[model samples]
Target: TPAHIAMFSIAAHGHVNPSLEVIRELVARGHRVTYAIPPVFADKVAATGARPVLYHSTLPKPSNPEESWPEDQESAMGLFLNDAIQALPQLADAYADDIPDLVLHDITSYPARVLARRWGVPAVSLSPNLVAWKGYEEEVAEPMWREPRQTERGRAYYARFEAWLKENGITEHPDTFASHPPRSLVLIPKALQPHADRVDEDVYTFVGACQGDRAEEGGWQRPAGAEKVVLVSLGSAFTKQPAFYRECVRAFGNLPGWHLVLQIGRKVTPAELGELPPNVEVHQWVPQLDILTKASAFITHAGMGSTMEALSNAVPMIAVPQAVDQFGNADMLQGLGVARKLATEEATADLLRETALALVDDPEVARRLRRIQAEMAQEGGTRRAADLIEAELPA
Candidate 1:
């Protein structure tokens, strides 16, 4: 009595990472899930117990740095449309013979909704960032660089997206189809959402964080002599800042009883950082969750994955957001009483040290994190996510 469920997403690490645990849980619950992804992430999808339905896509591949982002930030939005124009046909051909009963897609997977319309199936969005609320246009969109979406190129993108939908027998506009999905499962904590009073409960359900054990990600142990731990990471793609790493070294390198674990990424080398104190450890990559378990404080780029992961573990943050929704996420963390948001230019060693010290010293932050962690627990994570998807499955 299991239904054939088709899940689709772009191959961004953040986009795919949040839903893997949920996908794994669905398979365990006896639903047959087919995940369509680029070959770059085929192994990751297979690891989750879902059938990997491979297709060629021009969408941004987060794992590959050169293909990550365009030089012109304005083109990023249009790239989605362009990518889909190429991607939809490939996906349609792949699923031509055997169509699924229900479709679960990332917020970025616009074509999945289009195919669902053609196939007469429901498609649900798995939103990894803050979605629409009251004052969305006036507050967030209008004030936060939404002008690019109004450009000629932007209008053209929408026109093409809509035409493609109409070509496939869908009557809705791209704006309508993308905005009002059949259903959405928000992958962030409800607490991170601003203006929660204005969120429509009928369309978007706040599922909070859906992380599992993450034990397979590897492990780390604290050095024996360290008293407290501070982890500094900019996440992938955005970690080209040798200056940031240098600043971090200056902040916590000489501080006693505090061990600094800094991930400088592939682009930066230890030689670039010059000399470091004995207590500081610099690596290209570290076991993030493992380090977080013993971390007293985190200095992060405030990506939703890091935001949710940090708070879920009851750890406080010193947020320095780089771009996109990270800025909003950083602000939300500051608002949550468990973090300090700093501008990149202003994040000097003195400032970083001062702010990080304040975060770990605050009793309110520890208390707030515990309460948030408990609330995320109430949502029951992957179990609840699977239940929602299964409810959409037909008998």
Candidate 2:
């Protein structure tokens, strides 16, 4: 009999996209997987062969492209905390009847932790980026918790969480409820984790990057007559930069034998760019990983998903990090000699063209990318991850 696995995640692309390949791998191995996600991503999740368990919750939908980052970090964190706290009751109600044997959840998804504890099942934290290390409690969490802005937001967030638990006849400190349990599994590339020495090895297992097999996911076919391919994507959330797209067009517009695939995201239209070059293709979306396999160079936002894909394919990158951890990842890639980071202000046509050319021409960059790709390949990836999960299943 196949073990039942219930996975939970938020609706954002970064949070949900990395797990798709893993989910598909699990399903292929004959495990029953149910994904708890919002309706917006239900179809995408269903495409992975996992059963989509849609839930109605009080989370704030982005009003516009910039709604994700509010005035400050507290405001941003508050939005997520408020939604997670409010959604606890609804999540409880939604899954009250259907509980799986194991819980696989994104680190940021609070409902997964809550339900895992309530159902007495092993819970795995599928981190798409970095893992929370020991000193993180002091260096990251503590400082934020003590901040006046975060203090206010955290208090309110926890108060709602506490009230919900009390209403359900349970009594536990909000801090305890929010902390990772003893059996929690940490899933991410160990290379990305900061302060790695401080992490508790006993409680946390770092199953390196879950690299997905793209062939099984309706792979991308290379277009003929293109000697070189360049893939440009700014990730899902903040990809509405028309200014950036135009700059890209100016950079590769007339380059001989080069084809540029640009993903402008939802906010922009192809018509807005006016007359485009014959070699340039504009799309609101592109199958990124699929494209990267055939791409000679990738101009990316340095999001974890795109970064990992670029590294996995051993393709050189010109990283134009937009915000958040992307800047750090971009810098790290540069340090690793696999990419060149260009500031948004400096990402002009001349600079982009020169940088792209330089990145592809660099032998050390190609060598480093190949080395990392080999390491990633040896990590056992999706197969090892599935093995870890099966080890915890009831015998």
Candidate 3:
């Protein structure tokens, strides 16, 4: 039976990009898919054969590489709710006449869950990164919130969030709503997960990487006569460290028979990146997967997008986390013996070169990467994700 599936997410690339392939597959399977997102992604969303429903949102995006975030305890959760507090009703009106049979949403798109409750429909979460495991509240959330939860700002945020939920006929607390989805598709390899055994099988399913050919993102080939290649990318949001890029140049620029593809992104100019050796190349952006597919090692911020791409291509990584979940993902990668985690202060040129060389020289790292890649291939990626979404249709 065909069903109308409404998918929603916030405006950020990390949340929006990872789920596009799954949406594309859903559309191809004879489902009417409506993707409600900000204007920045409407064209990208429509390219997948899904109808684009543009909703106004004030969510922050990485318009610049040097963008800094509010460094407070309540800021993260507060700003999202502040946006949704206004954005939800507009979306509700957008779908008022034609309620969806099923809903899929990014974890941060809290409005989608409430809307599902309003229509009495099943809602699934499309987690672009790791999902909460057992004891996550006690182990992570509670400990992290223990201090801030008592503050006036934190208290007010929760009170307003609670009132908003009640206003929409949802009785579940706001904190739990983000974690306890009816079902979820974890778009990451199991190897990167922290505590796999503790995750409830009934709610979350690890569907691995749901990617397509991606050649349209563009393509690249190894420079002729380059004996070894290394790609250094800090990912999109936090690419501001000129010192890090400089260290990277110092590490690989003069090394014999090695080539470097460094992606410095928007904020930093080529002049800021400093002098480059003949062997080093710098660009604001490159076809990341294109380079990763042929590179020997990658120095990354270990964002889920970069981590999954590196693993899918069977490339080794040196993880340098910047903020949020990148640190945890980096730790997980280092634990798997496929990457080395480094703090910014510790990422000197000598340390970086040694770590990169170690990753490239270690047979164990190659073995682990290949193993994870094979497991990702078997996890049924985009096709299985679509099959699961189809199962939720009204039969």
Candidate 4:
């Protein structure tokens, strides 16, 4: 049956980009998908052949630096809570007369679950990053939230969350509501997930990277006569380090036959890098997958989206993580023997150059990449993800 599917997500690249290929696949299979997002990502959502339901959210701009955010755990969680409280009414009214038959949502979009409860339809979580594994609460969640959760402010925050859920006829605690989903489609390669053994397979399915060919985003050609190519990107949100960009210039600029394609993002200017070497190319943003497809090595911030892209292409990485989950990703990559993890302060010119050369030169690294690529291939990408989603549709 052809059914209307409502997809909900916030306004961040990491959250939205992973599910795009799945949405496109569903549309190609003759289903209608209406995507709910902030105005910032309206066009990107539309390009996937879905109707975009515009809603204003209260979260901080995705491009802002880490320092601009509140430092406390409770305060940061409150921002999302507040955004959902304000967003639910607008969404409810928008779909009052046109309820969807199914709901698919990014992990952070709390309102999606509530709307599912209201519409009496199944809700599927599209987790772009990590999902909770067996024993996750005792092993990870409790220790982190225990301290803050005991504080009065934390109590107040949970109280507000409880009140909101109650108003929506939901009785689950806020912790349970936000963290645990009845069903989920994990969007990254299984190799990237920690504790792959303990993850509950019945609840979460590892569908791998759902990124399509992405030919519409454009392409990059390897420069003629360049013997080897290296791409350096820190991702969209955390790209504020001019010093790091300068160090990269010193690292790869004059290497014998190596070509460096650098993406400095919107925060930095070309002038900040001083004079560039003839072998190096600089851009505000480059088609990362296009460059990765042809490159011999990658320097990245270790965000899950970028990490998976590098793995999918079988390119070795030099992970220079910036903040949050990136540190865990960096360590995981290093543990896999496919990359080197370097702290920002530790990413000097000599170290960066040494790591890149050594990584590409090792036959063992190449073998491991080939093996992982094979494993990921069998996990399936877009088509498998779409099939699983369609399975969840009501009769």
| lDDT to native, each model | 0.83, 0.77, 0.85, 0.88
Q: Give lDDT tens digits, candidate 4, residues 88-151.
A: 9999988888899999999989889999998899999999988999998898788887553688
Compose the digit string of candidate 2's lDDT tens values, residues 70-103: 4245555556656676666777787788888889
Model 3: lDDT equals 0.85
lDDT of 1 by residue, 1-395 (tens): 77888999977777888888989988887889999998998987898889999987787665565655553545665777777778889999999998999999997787798888889888888988778886676765556545646877777776787788788888876656666676888888888878777988888888887666666667888888787899999887678888888999999987989999998777777999988889899998777877888899999999888777888788999998887768878888888788899988899999999988888888999999999998888765777888887877776
lDDT of 2 at 323: 78
Which of 1 and 4 is ahead in TM-score?
4
Off by over 4 Å in 1: 70-74, 134-150
The TM-score between candidate 4 and the true structure equals 0.95
Per-model C-alpha RMSD: 2.2, 2.9, 1.7, 1.8
Off by over 4 Å in 4: 62-75
Error of 4 at 136 (Å): 0.6
Question: Which of candidates 1 and 3 is the stronger one according to TM-score?
Answer: 3
What lDDT does candidate 2 reach at residue 145?
54
Model 1 deviation from the true structure expressed as Cα RMSD, one decimal place: 2.2
Candidate whose lDDT is highest: 4
- The estimated TM-scores of all candidates read 0.93, 0.89, 0.95, 0.95
**In each prediction, how many residue pairs overlap at the backbone (N, C-alpha, C within less than 3 A)?**
0, 0, 0, 0
